[PDB]
Amino acid sequence: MQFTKCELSQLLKDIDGYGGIALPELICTMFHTSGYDTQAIVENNESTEYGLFQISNKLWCKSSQVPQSRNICDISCDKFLDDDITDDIMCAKKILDIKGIDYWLAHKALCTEKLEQWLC
Ligand SMILES: [Ca+2]
Incomplete structure (x- = not known):
């Protein structure tokens, strides 16, 4: 499924503030x-990040690429490629509670300030 920025901002209204993340950072x-x-x-050499929330098989979900993964979200990574971002949000909240905003932002500095362009 392909979304527009506005569609997605509405579906994600609820995650705003979760674990200190701001919705526009995410977007x-x-x-x-x-x-x-x-x-x-x-793709990275060793691991892959899937779907809107770019959830890694290194730790978070089960995939044949990384059979040793901890699978912290207790879910197949394939679920992060379907049209239902509900399971993706569940796992992103787990990520926020365990790792935090750094999962997305530590290496995406541009998405940590001057974020007015991401508003609907
Ligand atoms: Ca999904």
């Missing part, structure tokens, strides 16, 4: 990693 990361496409994948 910034999403624009750059998926173009708001729930089927996006970003």
Whole structure:
């Protein structure tokens, strides 16, 4: 599923403030990693990040690439490529509670200040 920035801002209204993340920070990361496409994948040599929230199989979900993964979200990574971002949000909240905003922002400085362009 492909979303617009406004569609997605409405679906994610609830996660705003969760664990200290701001919705526009999220939308910034999403624009750059998926173009708001729930089927996006970003590959690294060892691991892969899936879907809108770019959730890694290194730790967070089960995938044949990384059979040793801790699978902290107790879910197949395939669920992060479907059209239902509900499970993705569940796992992103776990990420926020365990790792925090750094998961998305530590290496995406542009999405940590001057964020007016991400408002609907
Ligand atoms: Ca999903």
